[PDB]
Amino acid sequence: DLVEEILRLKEERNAIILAHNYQLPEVQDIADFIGDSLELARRATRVDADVIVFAGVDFMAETAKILNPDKVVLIPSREATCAMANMLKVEHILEAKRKYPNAPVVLYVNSTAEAKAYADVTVTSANAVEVVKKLDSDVVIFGPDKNLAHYVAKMTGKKIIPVPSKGHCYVHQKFTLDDVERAKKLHPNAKLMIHPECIPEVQEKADIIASTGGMIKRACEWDEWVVFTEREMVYRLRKLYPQKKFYPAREDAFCIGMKAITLKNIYESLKDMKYKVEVPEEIARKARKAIERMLEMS
Ligand code: SF4
Ligand SMILES: [Cl-]
């Protein structure tokens, strides 16, 4: 019984389990806190636990370690990785900076810790517009997601240069205008909640544009929603609001990296104290500073 074993080991290890909204239902069901990556990392800084088991992808566990350097942070599989974050290389940032010497570098939190060390400021989907509006430059380097960059450009009026030029999340890139039309045909009383990682023409059809935390916040505004994000978010929303109706926008919006994590490797993570997440000191210090500037600018 993996659940019973996990619960006992969590107590033995003085551990907290943090799960991203895209984790499998059986993982969400054993987590202590569920949410998006930055919010989970922040909430753990106020928790008296010795060990964090991060049920999510590598950059999320890295952010938890950056903000909780004094805790052991475990990732259940090193194959839990983010294809979008991995598209942004330090080279891309430096090459972009050498080309636009006066442009600030704004890093979406969905990005490696190493990339964060070169950012002037980080952003979440929820604070990206307010942060970028406060930058003096009308030209901004933004990464790694070109679709979020386009949304920020629209809402700020600034020129936003995506780094890398084609950075994107393959899960969110799948959604199309045909998916929007089908959603309205199959669920005519639903409103559309759309992640800003979706393509701009799909963003324009949204009733609300928000990442997963904002979807949870704004779900109270209507009783039926079609959800344009990774499909496990539907499970999360149905558990939060059993009185509402939620429908996935697609049959295939599946993040392979998120689903590298299973109940069995959460058990093995606590049993064997693996896999330990470490962040080099200089990267961690610089990544912290960009995050702190984000919170001051928002
Ligand atoms: S859903 Fe997209 S952005 Fe999130 S971890 Fe998976 S690949 Fe990365
Ligand atoms: Cl994600």
Domain ranges of the chain: 1-76+258-280, 83-169, 170-251
Say how many Å lie between the CA of residue 218 and the centre of ligand 1: 22
In angstroms, rounded to a whole number, what is the distance separating the alpha carbons of residues 132 and 153?
9
Residue nearest to atom 1 of ligand 1 (CA): 255
Is residue 53 helix, strand or coil?
strand
Order of all β-strands in the sheet with 51-55 = 33-35, 15-20, 51-55, 72-74
CATH label, 170-251, candidates 3.40.50.10800, 3.30.360.10, 3.40.50.970, 2.60.40.10: 3.40.50.10800
Residue whose CA lies nearest to ligand 1 atom number 5 = 82
Cα of 169 from ligand 1 centre, angstroms: 6
Q: Report how far ligand 1's centroid is from the alpha carbon of 109 (Å).
A: 12
Q: How far is CA 104 from CA 122, 136, 143, 154, in A?
A: 11, 9, 11, 18
Euclidean distance between the first and the last CA atom of the chain, given in angstroms as a whole number: 45
260 lines ligand 1 (CB under 6 A): no
Q: Is it true that 1-76+258-280 and 170-251 share their CATH fold?
A: yes
The CATH class of 83-169 is alpha beta
Contacts of residue 138, defined as CB under 8 A and 6 or more positions apart, other chains included, come to 157, 158, 159
Query: Which residues are paired to 54 by β-bridges?
Result: 18
Would the CA dihedral through 43, 44, 48, 49 be positive or negative?
positive
Residue 212 φ/ψ, nearest 5 degrees: -65, -40
Contact between 108 and 276 (Cβ < 8 Å): no
Cα dihedral 175, 260, 67, 168, rounded to 10, equals: -30
Alpha carbon distance 88, 114 (integer Å): 10
The answer to whether the beta carbons of residues 175 and 204 sit under 8 Å apart is no
Cβ–ligand 1 distance for 82 under 6 Å, the answer yes
Pick the CATH number of 1-76+258-280 from 1.25.40.10, 3.40.50.10800, 2.40.430.10, 1.10.10.10: 3.40.50.10800
How far apart CA 126 and CA 161 sit, in angstroms, is: 19
Buried b (16+ CB within 10 A) or exposed e, 209-231: bbbbbbbbebbeebeebbbbbbb
Which atom of ligand 1 is found nearest the CA of 22?
Answer: 1
